[PDB]
Amino acid sequence: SPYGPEARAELSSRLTTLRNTLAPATNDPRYLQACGGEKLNRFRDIQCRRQTAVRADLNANYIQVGNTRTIACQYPLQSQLESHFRMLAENRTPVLAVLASSSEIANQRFGMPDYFRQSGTYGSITVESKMTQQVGLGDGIMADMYTLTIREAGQKTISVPVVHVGNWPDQTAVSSEVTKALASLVDQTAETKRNMYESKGSSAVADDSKLRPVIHCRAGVGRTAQLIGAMCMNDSRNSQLSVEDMVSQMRVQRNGIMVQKDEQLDVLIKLAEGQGRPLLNS
């Protein structure tokens, strides 16, 4: 069977070998390295692919699965906020999807700054956070939305649509119904903002490294990967892209953990089967 346990076991096998191969070795050439001793990676073993790094001081990667282009990153460290906001601004971010829970953010032991729900000043950058709408995704999962306006002297003021699922616990997978609802909402939000820039004749439209949806959570390899996978599967241009392709591409473009838990992979499998999308590559 195409979606039978034998097929699932084979997929899991192939991806496991890939994760182990991609594991970062000390001073790994494939991964972005910290500078002068200042922490770059929130987690020592969840690193950032150098070839696709967005900024030299952020754990963040440009990711292209099939035709879907995005940016995946870890929750910025307090010391990276300024550079983080810079990335968001320069990217003309059409949507910022944060899947880190409100509990994680609230726990000061985690060092996850409340940067998109609060207004403040960071270096020479000043940010305002306007709470907008709230959208249920099912099973009680809630999406809180905000408008993040980024201001800096001499720079074009940029406002960013934020989609925050604050009750999706770490290392777990919300149902495929919830995932599809979320991916639809994120893409929809992104399409509205991107359209705005295109109507204004923004030069960012001609730059493939810009206008990308930015997705992340705490480490940016689980809930983040699950959403990205769902998003690429919603792209009407990714016909024939298999789950194997999908997960391997995210892994080679960020790190080998992308799609952290089996439960998260299962959701991607389920969505694939729903569309008749192949799991393995022949």
Ligand SMILES: */C=C/S(=O)(=O)c1ccccc1
């Ligand atoms: C998108 C966050 S996550 O990848 O799910 C994660 C965060 C912290 C620890 C493990 C996974």
